[PDB]
Amino acid sequence: MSEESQAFQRQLTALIGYDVTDVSNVHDDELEFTRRGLVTPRMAEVASRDPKLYAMHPWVTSKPLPEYLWKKIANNCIFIVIHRSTTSQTIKVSPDDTPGAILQSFFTKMAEQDFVLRVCGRDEYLVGETPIKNFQWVRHCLKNGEEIHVVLDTPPDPALDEVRKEECDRKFRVKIRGIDIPVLPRNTDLTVFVEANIQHGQQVLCQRRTSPKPFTEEVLWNVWLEFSIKIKDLPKGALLNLQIYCLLYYVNLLLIDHRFLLRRGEYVLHMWQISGFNADKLTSATNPDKENSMSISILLDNHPIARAEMPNQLRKQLEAIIATDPLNPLTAEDKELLWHFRYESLKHPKAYPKLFSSVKWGQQEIVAKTYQLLARREVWDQSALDVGLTMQLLDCNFSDENVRAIAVQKLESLEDDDVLHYLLQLVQAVKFEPYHDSALARFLLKRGLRNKRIGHFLFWFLRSEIAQSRHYQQRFAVILEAYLRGCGTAMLHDFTQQVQVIEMLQKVTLDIKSLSAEKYDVSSQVISQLKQKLENLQNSQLPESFRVPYDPGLKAGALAIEKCKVMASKKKPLWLEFKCADPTALSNETIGIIFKHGDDLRQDMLILQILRIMESIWETESLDLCLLPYGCISTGDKIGMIEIVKDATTIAKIQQSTVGNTGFKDEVLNHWLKEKSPTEEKFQAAVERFVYSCAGYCVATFVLGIGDRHNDNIMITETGNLFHIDFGHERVPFVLTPDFLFVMGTSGKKTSPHFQKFQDICVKAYLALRHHTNLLIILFSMMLMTGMPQLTSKEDIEYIRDALTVGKNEEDAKKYFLDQIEVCRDKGWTVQFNWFLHLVL
User: Fold this and answer.
1) Quick one: 543 and 564 in the same domain?
2) Where on this chain does ATP bind?
3) Domain-terminating residue out of 472, 488, 504
């Protein structure tokens, strides 16, 4: 069409990082089919959204104000500071008052209504029919004893969000002709064979193998592999998995396509090589490197899909089976029970995953009976939303469209604030979808298009995978383009500025990394080289401003080049500082951002997010463990950005500042916090804040199995907030060293009010997490599968079960954690000092 449209597709390409008009690594048209399919979902949501609310993206929640926040409000009054240039009043407000009606207790209270309340120095708006106590920024300020500063201004023009107009009962068989690799001369000549499996939800319905052969650059068989299963019995979503054993290579091929047709013809698939289970093993995409990769040729020639009350004791076995954790193995007897008593199982929402893993997916008739079962879904549709349960139906164990659809049906009722808590996990679960176009993908598109804050993050989370995942960039690129075509010109302009900026800093980051070895030091030479390179960007290259990716409400302006530098650490990350591009800001504080290469930040994103979930869980129990899950966004392979937490240092640096360089003293931390406190009041608050954050990190880290850390991977703020960093990838359950104890007033396995206050916080935090045992187990397994390499679909995922002490009663749970606290006491500095070596098992 018009040269305009081409220029537009070109802009989308640069935002996405991938050319969705690329047909280099395809064998069918699923991707194009999907791009067309997403037009309707997007357009429907675009026309549905309120232009005003979409513009101002108020950030609100329906959840009740936690007890620990009402404490700061024991007068039914809240103080809002309204700025208006050099003016600044302080209207007292009631927690129930609406923004539009405090704008009423203002205008008239002072003395024209075409105004709105906006947070000072942020693109955050307090509008819409909502109690002010329900606005997140309001709770963020209460939770941090900060004052609420707002500015009276004009609403953003929704015009700016304008969207560009658009315009057989035979047995199944497969012949394996042979395999081919260009170069293979290796050490000891081994043998090789091909394994063909028919899978569905990570379940081998049928397996066939070829005879072993000498592993040469070209190995042939020209042999038919016949399965016992009938063609008519192939379930939609089933994959033909092909593997080469010497396991060295795999590749998958969807047996039934996106149009419900049985795959047919000759295929030459370029395979993925295993690096001397995870979501990457389930991909239907093929290896884009056609020159130097292993390939397997096959031929396919064969469309489809044209009372009794439970006795007392069997009901007891059923209920026992239902209560087990998601990781409990299902015996054949269990499955038969779940299936035979199908209609009873359907009355226990928690049984749904166990039940669906009991279906014989390779039997047409059984599958047919299953859809009949879902037909009468009354009980499920009326169930109270249970996110942990919904995620189980979206993991790798369920390939059925209909089964995964009722999971998505339940996500529909989440409020935006909740979608944000699980967004990263919902995006990662798109990897478990057998087809590119899916209800889950449709659900993300829609919520992203419905809310600016969700769309912003959906953008970065999809871009993150498109930039580095060969296995899923294709599917994720199509979904992103679909969202970019509906977020509006303004957002499109913002993403464009963000991308140009991060893309430049990414280049600088890498080039500087070259001018620096491993052996820590950092010379004035590499820093001079940094400042020169930044000086060049500061010119007409780096846009006047841009929104901080992990903190969309913040706008950064020019770089404070004089404050920029290279950090002295194994990796040589850049430490950048920018001025805030918002004059209404309440300070002169610059925005710090670390750009780093050498760590897979996808893992950090995953950990930080679960940390946020653990926080919301504690809130529903009136607890505030004071975690600090700082902004982090993986922007590419082994590279990304990290928020710079102000006034924070490493616990190793504090020790180093007192004792030798590579040197451990118990009182160092306590001395540091006292010297950094402006008053005794502030110092006492910091020690309190330290007790709470220390307990929150010991519990969070123990459950996630990442408690054993070296000191340099743990920081503390001058205000006492402890927090772990760098999740990139004798023993101790967590870190609670002599110095941490000294701050709590104890030493040498003694006692103290703070230590005791510490042990009480930990137990309470620990059992509040056990009450969400299944949610946590499923988030932990999704995280290993979508973030780590080859995770043992057993032992590794099993850790969380033991850590959550599954099975035990509350008393044994409390007892168990207290002992973990004792082990740390017994080890003292042992483990810390050892941290030079390694950790395994």
Assistant:
1) yes
2) 592-601, 627-635, 723-729
3) 488
Rounded Cα–Cα distance for residues 386 and 243 (Å): 37
Q: Is 639 annotated as a binding residue?
A: no
User: What is the C-alpha to C-alpha distance for residues 10 and 19, in angstroms, rounded to an integer?
Assistant: 8
Instruction: Say whether both 312 and 401 belong to one domain.
Output: yes
728 is in an annotated binding site: yes
Residue 356 and residue 235 in contact, taking contact as beta carbons nearer than 8 Å: no
740 marked ligand binding residue: no
334 and 477 part of one domain: yes
Neighbours of 358 (CB within 10 A): 22
In a domain, 838, yes or no: no
DSSP string, 697-723: HHHHHHHTT-----GGGEEEETTS-EE
Whether 188 and 74 share a structural domain: no
Residue that is last in its domain, among 452, 467, 488:
488
The annotation status of 727 as a binding-site residue, yes or no, is yes
Residue 295 marked in a binding site? no
| Cα distance between residue 666 and residue 671, in whole Å | 10
Resolution at which this structure was determined, Å: 2.0
Beta bridge partners of 214: 191
Q: For the chain, how many structural domains are there in total?
A: 5
840 within some domain = no
Is 824 annotated as ligand-binding?
Answer: no
Quickly tell me which residue has 């600090």 as its tokens. 628
Any idea what the CATH number is for the domain that residue 435 is in?
Answer: 1.25.40.70
558 φ, ψ (degrees, to nearest 5)? -70, 150
**Residue with token string 């999740």:** 727
631 is in an annotated binding site: yes
160 in a known ligand binding site = no
Which CATH number characterizes residue 296's domain?
A: 2.60.40.150
Are 172 and 154 members of one domain?
no
591, 585 Cβ separation under 8 angstroms: no
633 labelled binding-site residue = yes
Tell me how far apart the alpha carbons of residues 341 and 359 are, in angstroms, rounded to a whole number.
Answer: 12
How remote is the C-alpha of 472 from its chain's centroid? Answer: 16
> Residues preceding discontinuities in the chain at C–N > 2.5 Å?
111, 167, 246, 276, 302, 306, 663, 729
505: nearest Cα among 559, 581, 463: 559
Contact 240, 174 (CB under 8 A): yes
How was this model experimentally determined? X-ray
363, 371 in Cβ contact below 8 A? no
Helix 680-703 and helix 753-770, axial crossing angle in degrees, nearest 10: 40
Beta carbons of 154 and 202 less than 8 angstroms apart? no
Whether 609 is in a domain gets the answer yes
Residue 253 known to bind ligand:
no
CATH of the domain at 743: 1.10.1070.11
Q: Which residue range is the domain that position 149 belongs to?
A: 2-166
Could you tell me if 216 and 138 lie in one domain?
A: no
Domain contains 839: no
Nearest Cα to Cα of residue 415 among 619, 772, 134, 148: 134
* Cβ-count burial 671-702 (b if 16+ within 10 Å, e if not): bbbeebbeeeebbeebbebbbbbbbbbbbbbb
Looking at the fold, whether 565 and 653 belong to one and the same domain comes out as no
CB 36 within 8 A of CB 482: no
Helices (H), 451-573: 452-468, 473-484, 489-514, 524-537
Is 125 annotated as contributing to ligand binding?
no
Q: What is the CATH number of the domain that holds 61?
A: 3.10.20.90
Q: Compute the distance between CA of residue 502 and CA of residue 412 in angstroms, rounded to an integer.
A: 33
- Is residue 765 domain-shared with residue 803, that is, in the same domain? yes
Residue 629 assigned to a binding site:
yes
Residue where the block lists tokens 């040197």: 663
| Annotated binding residue 630 | yes
Q: Is 37 annotated as a binding residue?
A: no
Q: Which CATH number does the domain housing residue 493 bear?
A: 3.30.1010.10
Buried b / exposed e over 192-207, threshold 16 CB at 10 Å, is bbbbbbbbbbbbebbe
